[PDB]
Design a protein around this ligand. Structure first.
Ligand code: GNP
Ligand code: MG
Length: 169
């Protein structure tokens, strides 16, 4: 049997939302992408013996002034909130996006996963692992660091959001 679940991937511009999603879906790293308008993939994945049809909504980068789109606040089973460990701006912005998201969804509990991407860029890192982890803990959210170059880290991100969604019955 298969379960159908819809996941939105959100964050600031150029944090690697598309590259992470593509690494998961297609198993390859894309060196340069167009800025996203909106893409949607359906990917088969098994989590704890359960097969899922994952509908993955890869969204346009938002900044702190972006209206959080209402279409992403209904009928979504899980959220992946992505920043880059190389960008302080992306980290400030993900805090704003999170607040707007929580406003939109209202009194329904939603699974949220915070992801610090581009961890392979050691020389450009400006955010520690610990600051990301502390933020996730304050949100009661899952936390992982990832690299879109590293297939296992991308797979782990999508498995984890599913694990978290399942916990909410
Ligand atoms: N070294 C490294 N580069 C990455 C990683 N993730 C993304 N990039 C690079 O960073 C740039 C932006 O990636 P992209 O996936 O387009 O980011 P995005 O969040 O989808 N941008 P947008 O919000 O405009 O749709 C690309 O050049 C991409 O190859 C990563 O984990 N490591
Ligand atoms: Mg993109």
């Amino acid at each position: 049997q298969s379960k159908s679940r819809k996941i939105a991937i959100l964050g600031y511009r150029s944090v690697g939302k598309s590259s992470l999603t593509i690494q998961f879906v297609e198993g390859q790293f894309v060196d340069s992408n167009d800025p996203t308008i909106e893409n949607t993939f359906t990917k088969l994945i098994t989590v704890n013996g359960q097969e899922y049809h994952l509908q993955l909504v890869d969204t346009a980068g938002q900044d702190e002034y972006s209206i959080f789109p209402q279409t992403y606040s209904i009928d979504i089973n899980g959220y992946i909130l992505v920043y880059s460990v190389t960008s302080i701006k992306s980290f400030e912005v993900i805090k704003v996006i999170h607040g707007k998201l929580l406003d939109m969804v209202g009194k329904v509990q939603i699974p949220i996963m915070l992801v610090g991407n581009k961890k392979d860029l050691h020389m450009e890192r400006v955010i520690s692992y610990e600051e990301g982890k502390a933020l996730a803990e304050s949100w009661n959210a899952a936390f992982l660091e990832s690299s879109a170059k590293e297939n296992q880290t991308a797979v782990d991100v999508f498995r984890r959001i599913i694990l978290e969604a399942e916990k909410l019955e």
